[PDB]
């Protein structure tokens, strides 16, 4: 197998990988990108005169990393635990009729729920945060201005 036969295989592999890439069939496109790069790697070992070969190897392997697709979920798990904690504390002051602290704690929960919902695109998370903020604001206002 010489460079000329390896370069031609590399062209048929990449042509098939890009059309599967186009079709969103990303998992078989990884396979043919990996076959393409490997054909080129052997081709450079065989003395390939192709002038952009190293670039094209690197192109295809990067496309495999791009298609392969965290610490933000960690942050949001803790933010929710805090909102839950704040509301729980407020629940404590609420039942003990420590009205002023209950109001402060309910409204700090509000700020945390609205602020966290600007840090996400998950609309289901956004609404759950806004429903807890709405509920806590309602109760704070109930403690603050009894009708």
Partner 1 sequence: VLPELPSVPDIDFDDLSRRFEELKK
What residues make contact with partner 1 under the rule CB under 8 A? 10-11, 14-15, 18, 21-22, 36, 52, 56, 59-60, 62-63, 66, 77, 80-81, 83-84, 87, 91, 94, 128, 131-132, 135-136, 138-139, 142
CB 99 to partner 1: min, Å? 13
Residue tagged 């390939």 (tokens): 48
Alpha-carbon gap, residue 123 to 146, rounded angstroms: 34
Long-range contacts of 23-27 (CB under 8 A, 24+ apart): 26/67
Radius of gyration of the chain (CA): 29
CB 66 to partner 1: min, Å? 6
Q: Which is nearer to partner 1, 21 or 108 (CB)?
A: 21
Question: Which tokens is 17 given?
Answer: 């990988």
Number of residues that this document lists for the chain? 147
φ/ψ of 52, rounded to 5, equals: -105, 30
Q: Which is nearer to partner 1, 35 or 63 (CB)?
A: 63
Q: Which is nearer to partner 1, 24 or 47 (CB)?
A: 24
Q: Which is nearer to partner 1, 1 or 8 (CB)?
A: 8
CB 135 to partner 1: min, Å? 5
CB 70 to partner 1: min, Å? 16
Question: Which tokens is 131 given?
Answer: 């429903």
Residue tagged 């990303």 (tokens): 26
């Amino acid at each position: 197998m010489d460079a000329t036969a390896l370069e031609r295989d590399a062209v048929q592999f990449a042509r098939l990988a890009v059309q599967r890439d186009h079709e969103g069939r990303y998992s078989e496109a990884v396979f043919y990108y990996k076959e393409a790069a490997q054909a080129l790697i052997y081709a450079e070992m065989a003395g390939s005169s192709l002038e952009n070969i190293q670039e094209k190897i690197t192109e295809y392997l990067e496309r495999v990393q791009a298609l392969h697709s965290d610490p933000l979920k960690s942050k949001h798990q803790l933010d929710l635990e805090r909102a839950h904690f704040l509301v729980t504390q407020a629940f404590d002051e609420d039942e003990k009729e420590n009205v002023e602290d209950a109001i402060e704690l309910y409204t700090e929960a509000v700020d945390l729920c609205l602020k966290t919902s600007y840090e996400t695109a998950d609309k289901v998370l956004q609404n759950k945060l806004k429903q807890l903020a709405r509920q806590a604001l309602d109760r704070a206002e109930a403690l603050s201005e009894p009708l």
